[PDB]
């Protein structure tokens, strides 16, 4: 049943009654391991991995941005307060 090698991207196949099951490598998902995890850096997906603001760009990588009172860090995703009392932070807990 696995005989047609349907798991793409390096995955293993284990045949079942009336079908199969693909065990994917870490970076892949999908019935047939056809779905590229590395490959959906978009804003509607966990916020583009941005800490605050996400901008999708035509043809290029999404960029992250920050609220006022905040500036973007080296890693390109995190924000850091640039002021004393940043909005939406609780100083008693900070």
């Amino acid at each position: 049943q696995c005989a047609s090698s349907p798991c793409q991207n390096g995955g293993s196949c284990k045949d079942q009654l009336q079908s199969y099951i693909c065990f994917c490598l870490p970076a892949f998902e999908g019935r047939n391991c056809e779905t590229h995890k590395d490959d959906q850096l978009i804003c509607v997906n966990e916020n583009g991995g941005c800490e605050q603001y996400c901008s999708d760009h035509t043809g290029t990588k999404r960029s992250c941005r920050c609220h006022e009172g905040y500036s973007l860090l080296a890693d390109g995703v995190s924000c850091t307060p640039t002021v004393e009392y940043p909005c939406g932070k609780i100083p008693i807990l900070e």
Partner: protein, 190 residues
């Protein structure tokens, strides 16, 4: 724009897929899945497929109950009910992997026929559940919850091994299950 319907969970060995209908006529879908009080997480963005592999999300806690919902969009878009100003969606049934996933058809591996007795052993088959990039086995996930059942008239064990005396098919079983209690018969051997 049409709402998905007949949303169903197809799951074996924790490998988990949600399927629904209809096949998209100028519309795409996105799935959201979540535990009963987690945030929602998107998968399968703007697909024209009518299925979504949710295995990665559900194996993160197999004892939780998950709800998925599937959104429909035009063309085109990105908006909206109109009406409520949100995407049209529809909800899956609830799903609790540890209790509903189909046990995969096991496979007998070993038949050493020692004395007056044959010792037929069943294989601890790997599941889609990972710990550290590597895959846990049926025994790792179910422990004392999983027993087996031999036809050879019938026997039974709760280890991965039987032992009888002077044909052979098995059966994974989780007795505490309200549903999908019994696996399917291993391919018959001797």
């Amino acid at each position: 724009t049409v709402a998905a319907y007949n949303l169903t969970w197809k799951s074996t060995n924790f490998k988990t897929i949600l399927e629904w209908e209809p096949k998209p006529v100028n519309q795409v879908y996105t799935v959201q899945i979540s535990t009963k009080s987690g945030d929602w997480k998107s998968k399968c963005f703007y697909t024209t497929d009518t299925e979504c592999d949710l295995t990665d999300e559900i194996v993160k806690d197999v004892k939780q109950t998950y709800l998925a919902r599937v959104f429909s969009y035009p063309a085109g878009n990105v908006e909206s009910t109109g009406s409520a100003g949100e995407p049209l969606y529809e909800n899956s049934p609830e799903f609790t992997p540890y209790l509903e996933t189909n046990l995969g058809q096991p496979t007998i591996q070993s038949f050493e026929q020692v004395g007056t007795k044959v010792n037929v052993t069943v294989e601890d088959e790997r599941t889609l559940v990972r710990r550290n990039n590597t895959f846990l086995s049926l025994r790792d996930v179910f422990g004392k919850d999983l027993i087996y059942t031999l036809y050879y008239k019938t026997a039974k064990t709760n280890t991965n091994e039987f032992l009888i005396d002077v044909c052979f098919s098995v059966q994974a079983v989780i007795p505490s299950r309200t549903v999908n209690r019994k696996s399917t018969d291993s391919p018959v051997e001797c």
